Structures are given as C-alpha cells and as structure tokens.
Amino acid sequence: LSPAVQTFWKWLQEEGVITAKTPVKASVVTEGLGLVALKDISRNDVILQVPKRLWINPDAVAASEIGRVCSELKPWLSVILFLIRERSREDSVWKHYFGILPQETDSTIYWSEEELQELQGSQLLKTTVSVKEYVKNECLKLEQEIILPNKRLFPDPVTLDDFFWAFGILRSRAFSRLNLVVVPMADLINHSAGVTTEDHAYEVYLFSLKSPLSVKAGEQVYIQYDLNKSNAELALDYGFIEPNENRHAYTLTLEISESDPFFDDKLDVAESNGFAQTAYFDIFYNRTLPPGLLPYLRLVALGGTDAFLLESLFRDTIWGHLELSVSRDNEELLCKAVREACKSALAGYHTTIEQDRELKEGNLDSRLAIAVGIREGEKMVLQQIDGIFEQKELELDQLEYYQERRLKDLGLCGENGDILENLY
Numbered sequence: 001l002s003p004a005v006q007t008f009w010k011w012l013q014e015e016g017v018i019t020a021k022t023p024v025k026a027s028v029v030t031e032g033l034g035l036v037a038l039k040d041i042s043r044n045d046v047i048l049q050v051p052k053r054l055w056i057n058p059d060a061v062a063a064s065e066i067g068r069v070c071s072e073l074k075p076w077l078s079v080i081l082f083l084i085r086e087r088s089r090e091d092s093v094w095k096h097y098f099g100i101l102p103q104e105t106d107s108t109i110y111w112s113e114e115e116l117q118e119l120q121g122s123q124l125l126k127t128t129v130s131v132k133e134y135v136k137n138e139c140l141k142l143e144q145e146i147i148l149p150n151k152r153l154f155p156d157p158v159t160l161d162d163f164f165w166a167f168g169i170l171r172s173r174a175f176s177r178l179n180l181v182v183v184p185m186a187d188l189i190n191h192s193a194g195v196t197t198e199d200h201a202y203e204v205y206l207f208s209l210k211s212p213l214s215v216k217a218g219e220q221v222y223i224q225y226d227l228n229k230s231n232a233e234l235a236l237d238y239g240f241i242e243p244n245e246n247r248h249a250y251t252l253t254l255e256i257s258e259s260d261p262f263f264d265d266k267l268d269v270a271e272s273n274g275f276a277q278t279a280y281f282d283i284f285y286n287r288t289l290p291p292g293l294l295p296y297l298r299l300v301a302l303g304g305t306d307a308f309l310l311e312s313l314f315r316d317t318i319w320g321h322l323e324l325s326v327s328r329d330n331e332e333l334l335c336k337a338v339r340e341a342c343k344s345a346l347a348g349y350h351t352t353i354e355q356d357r358e359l360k361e362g363n364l365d366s367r368l369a370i371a372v373g374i375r376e377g378e379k380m381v382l383q384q385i386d387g388i389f390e391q392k393e394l395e396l397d398q399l400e401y402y403q404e405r406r407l408k409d410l411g412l413c414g415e416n417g418d419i420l421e422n423l424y
C-alpha cells in the first residue's frame with residue numbers, strides 16, 4: 001500500500017485505537033487517502049473511535065512545553081506553532097501521522113501565480129489574496145515574539161511555507177463539531193455529495209465517528225463536509241468544488257458612506273434594525289434575494305427627496321417602508337447601481353461562460369477545474385442578479401411607492417359629512 005501509511009496503521013493498532021471492532025482499512029483513492037469498508041457497514045454505524053490522548057487542539061498545546069508561550073495566543077495561531085514543532089521532533093506522538101499528511105492541498109492558498117490568473121476577476125481570488133496576506137502577517141509576528149525569542153523550544157528555522165502548511169492542514173482537516181480539533185484516525189475520511197446529514201461525530205473521552213451512509217464491503221465511507229459552504233468556500237477551505245450549481249454564490253457588500261450627507265440618520269436606521277455601517281449579503285444561484293438586501297439598498301439610495309423618512313416620526317416604521325419600497329426615483333437609482341456593478345464585474349473575467357463550459361467538457365487538472373468551475377458560477381450568479389434587477393426596471397411602475405400608499409386612505413367618496421357637522 002504505502003510505507004508511510006502501513007507505518008501509520010500499525011501505529012494506531014498498538015495504540016489500541018484500531019483493533020477488531022474497526023470495520024475499515026486505509027486505502028489509496030482518487031481523492032488521496034480514504035477509509036474503505038472492510039465489511040458491509042450500515043447507517044449511523046461507528047467506524048472508529050480515537051483517544052483524546054491523540055487530539056491536537058488548543059488544549060493539546062497548553063499541556064506541552066510551549067503551553068506557556070502561547071498562553072495568550074489565539075487558539076489557531078497556537079496550533080499552527082504546535083504543528084510545526086511536533087513535525088520536527090523525531091520523537092513526537094504524531095511522527096507517523098505527519099508522514100501521512102499531504103505536503104500541499106489544492107486549496108487556492110497554494111496556487112502558483114499562473115494558476116491564480118485563472119481566477120482573474122473573481123471574488124475567490126480577492127478572498128484568497130486577503131486570507132493569504134493576513135495569515136502571513138500574523139505568522140511573521142509569531143516568529144518575532146515566540147519562534148525567535150524561545151530558541152530552546154523552536155530550534156529549527158520556521159519559513160512561511162511551514163506556516164501555510166500548518167494553516168492549510170488546520171483548515172482542511174480539523175473538525176469543528178463541538179471547535180478546532182484534529183483527530184489522526186478519522187482525519188482521513190473524505191467528502192461526498194452523496195451524504196446529506198452533516199453531523200456524525202461525538203464521544204463517550206474520545207472521537208466517535210459514525211458513517212452516515214450504508215457502505216457495502218469494498219467501497220469507501222464518505223461524509224458531508226458542510227452542506228452550507230459555497231463552492232468559493234469549499235475551493236478555499238479544501239481543494240475542491242461540486243458540480244452542483246446551487247453551490248455557486250457571490251457576496252455583495254453594501255455600506256452607508258460617511259460621505260453621505262445623511263450618514264448619521266441612515267446609520268441609525270440601519271443599526272436599529274440589525275445592520276451595521278457595512279453589511280455583506282450572500283447571493284446563491286436559483287435562490288431568492290436575502291431578506292434585507294433591498295431595504296438596505298433603498299436606504300443607501302435614499303437621497304434628498306425622500307429624506308423626510310429619516311425624521312424621528314417614522315423611526316418606528318421607516319424599515320417597513322424601506323421594505324415596501326420608497327419612491328420610483330429611489331427604486332430606479334438602486335437598480336442602475338446594482339446592474340452596473342454586475343456588468344462591470346462580469347467584465348473583469350477573461351472568458352465567457354460558453355468558453356468555460358466548453359473547457360469543462362474536456363479533461364482539466366485539479367486546480368484548473370476549480371478555477372473554471374468557480375468562475376463560470378460567479379458569472380452565473382452575477383448574470384442572474386443583473387437579470388433580476390432588469391425585470392424590476394421593467395416593473396418599475398407596478399410597485400406602489402410611499403406617496404401612493406399614503407393617499408390610499410383618502411376616502412374622498414365618503415358621506416356628505418357637512419350635513420352632520422352642520423347639525424351641531
């Protein structure tokens with residue numbers, strides 16, 4: 001099978017982890033390493049249990065030599081160091097475990113410069129550049145204040161690659177179902193679009209992993225990594241995406257500018273209703289617009305004419321009005337801003353959807369596939385969004401704006417009230 005793997009398996013045996021009550025063997029699969037059922041496994045069956053003696057979470061770093069130096073470090077930044085360290089110690093408890101870990105995954109955080117150009121104009125590129133930088137800065141500060149100062153516990157030098165490796169390992173393997181633990185045994189299990197439960201990890205301490213599906217002897221055991229993450233998120237967290245169009249999202253960001261002459265009043269309205277000066281709205285394919293997206297767009301576009309809605313008078317209704325629509329000019333202003341944003345963005349990509357789809361018709365490499373799939377999707381959501389507001393621009397008059405809703409209760413045709421008024 002594999003020297004490293006065989007050694008890793010025998011290691012867990014002596015540990016008592018893998019014994020006779022273990023219905024699965026490690027095997028080499030299309031997705032790397034994975035757990036293959038040694039015999040017909042049924043639903044909710046426990047595949048394996050690992051001793052907390054073998055975790056690698058914040059607690060683990062606390063009870064080690066570097067427990068004190070990281071005493072005030074964020075949970076993750078602490079495990080990043082713990083990982084790098086134990087990976088060097090040729091006597092660590094995870095010696096055989098580290099000989100199983102991939103030196104790199106397909107997560108965008110490892111992509112080369114040319115690879116990244118395949119995500120040109122995409123939001124995923126923006127997000128990955130942002131994440132990459134942040135973790136760089138945070139980890140460079142770690143070297144200065146913990147890696148260098150303590151030359152006794154951190155002998156060997158620590159490079160960025162070491163940093164991203166630990167960050168990557170951490171972000172593609174840890175289980176947050178408790179919220180940041182690494183379990184050497186069930187660490188292998190892979191993701192499948194088959195599974196649709198997304199909850200199969202408990203303990204009686206240890207790690208009980210129960211196969212959500214019914215696998216036949218010989219076949220692989222999968223699980224759902226995260227029913228809610230978007231492809232952009234899957235692509236970054238792990239090195240893969242699904243073909244499922246409903247995984248394609250694109251997030252819009254709106255904010256009440258301080259350059260807005262009404263910033264103060266608007267910010268008040270926003271916040272009194274659960275929104276901040278800056279708010280992000282996630283837009284998924286074939287899904288309906290997030291609640292709040294429109295009222296916030298109308299609040300942004302408010303402007304002079306409808307400014308009277310920002311008086312203490314409506315503070316208890318302003319949001320409702322924002323939800324029903326303000327005025328034809330407000331509605332028409334926001335629609336253009338949004339559609340222009342989408343057209344502008346759609347222009348940032350270097351290929352058309354027809355092209356990406358022809359590309360998917362052939363054989364693409366891991367990372368290229370991800371890029372192409374990701375960008376085709378983003379273009380779809382962007383195009384959908386533009387479509388939605390295009391309709392709105394046509395129905396721009398079918399809505400009943402503030403004023404009309406006002407004169408709805410005029411009651412011109414009542415009674416000759418003057419008869420009565422003239423009776424007293």
Ligand SMILES: CN(CC[C@H](N)C(=O)O)C[C@H]1O[C@@H](n2cnc3c(N)ncnc32)[C@H](O)[C@@H]1O
Nearest residue numbers: 031032033034105172173187188190191239240
């Ligand atoms: C959760 N980890 C499992 C480790 C993996 N079993 C191994 O040891 O190679 C992360 C890895 O699972 C792989 N993975 C999980 N689900 C899929 C999938 N549907 N397609 C391709 N790779 C997958 C990722 O590429 C990543 O390298």
Ligand SMILES: N[C@@H](CCCC[NH3+])C(=O)O
Nearest residue numbers: 172173174175176177225
């Ligand atoms: N993020 C998912 C799946 C991670 C699997 C890593 N091997 C969870 O809640 O555990």
